[PDB]
């Protein structure tokens, strides 16, 4: 690793990922984790985050401009 940025997902990163996953589900994104009879995109997105199956990589910008790439599975939910 050797990265100053925290391995755990930041609260702001968690909010954006959940919003993005919910946005994809409403559009008609294929579900990595099957919904438990849920018509609400936000509810499915939270279960997908717990599963960590979401296909999202987050790029973190350092002051020097170095970029850190973290997979959703690698990131640890803040809550």
């Amino acid at each position: 690793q050797k990265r100053i940025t925290t391995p755990y997902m930041t609260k702001y990163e968690r909010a954006r990922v959940l919003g993005t996953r919910a946005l994809q589900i409403a559009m008609c994104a294929p579900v990595m984790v099957e919904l438990e009879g849920e018509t609400d995109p936000l509810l499915i997105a939270m279960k997908e985050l717990k599963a960590r199956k979401i296909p999202i990589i987050i790029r973190r910008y350092l002051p020097d401009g170095s970029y850190e790439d973290w997979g959703v599975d690698e990131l640890i939910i803040s809550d």
């Binding site: 050797k2 100053i4 925290t6 930041t10 609260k11 702001y12 973190r60 350092l62 002051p63």
Partner: protein, 241 residues
């Protein structure tokens, strides 16, 4: 309007819109404002003689130790000089930490703001594990001392391979580490808490998870929060005192 620009970066350094650093760590502790809670050190306030007696953990009597420890554990402590030396070492280190606390505060008030309260969790642990005060602790004394050291190593506010970055984390956790040593001192654990070895391990895990949650998330705008927070007290203040 003036403080809205100030914000915390990914490296956790608070900076202005110009990006000039305002603080290396947010709040000088790099921890969330809500997470810190008031706790009593209970080291500086008691007299030196009272502090020495409280943490002495003397094995010479062999009867006070027998009351606070299981028969197998106390005989093992007497059998090995090294185990006794470790018990003496923690007390000596605690005395140095107490002198550091006196340097930090001339008043030396016990009250301080720290992220995790060990006492509240220990009380919850005693109820969960149904710990009995009459029963002597089943946890070996050296294991209690090693557990405090392991927890301090696990929690790092700043992680840097280069020297002075690791030292910065030690300064950030210095107050918490001194409180951790006094609360989890082997003499104190055996004398009153009598916590089981599993309960102590559970407590160490609980503190680590809460401490990681305590660290402030990067990208927060600290300046905007600070300016609005000051306004609410200003309204309470009378126009003419």
């Amino acid at each position: 309007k003036s403080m809205e620009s100030v914000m915390v970066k990914y490296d956790a350094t608070v900076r202005n819109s110009i990006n000039q650093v305002v603080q290396l760590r947010y709040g000088e502790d790099g921890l969330a404002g809500e997470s810190v809670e008031f706790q009593n050190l209970a080291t500086l306030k008691p007299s030196n003689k009272a502090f020495e007696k409280k943490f002495r953990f003397d094995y010479t009597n062999e009867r006070a130790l027998r009351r606070t420890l299981q028969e197998d554990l106390v005989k093992d402590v007497l059998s090995n000089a090294h185990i006794q030396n470790e018990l003496e070492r923690e007390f000596e280190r605690m005395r140095e930490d107490r002198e550091v606390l006196r340097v930090i505060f001339p008043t030396g008030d016990s009250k301080v703001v720290l992220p995790c309260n060990l006492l509240r969790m220990i009380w919850n642990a005693q109820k969960i594990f149904h710990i009995n005060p009459r029963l002597p602790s089943d946890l070996h004394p050296i294991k209690v001392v090693e557990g405090v050291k392991e927890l301090s190593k696990k929690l790092v506010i700043v992680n840097g391979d280069d020297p002075l970055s690791r030292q910065a984390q030690e300064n950030a956790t210095l107050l918490f580490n001194i409180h951790l040593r006094s609360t989890l001192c082997s003499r104190r654990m055996a004398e009153e808490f009598r916590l089981s070895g599993e309960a102590f391990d559970w407590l160490l895990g609980e503190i680590e998870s809460k401490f990681n949650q305590a660290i402030a998330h990067p990208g927060e705008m600290v300046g905007a929060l600070a300016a609005q927070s000051l306004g609410e007290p200003a309204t309470q203040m009378t126009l003419n005192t």
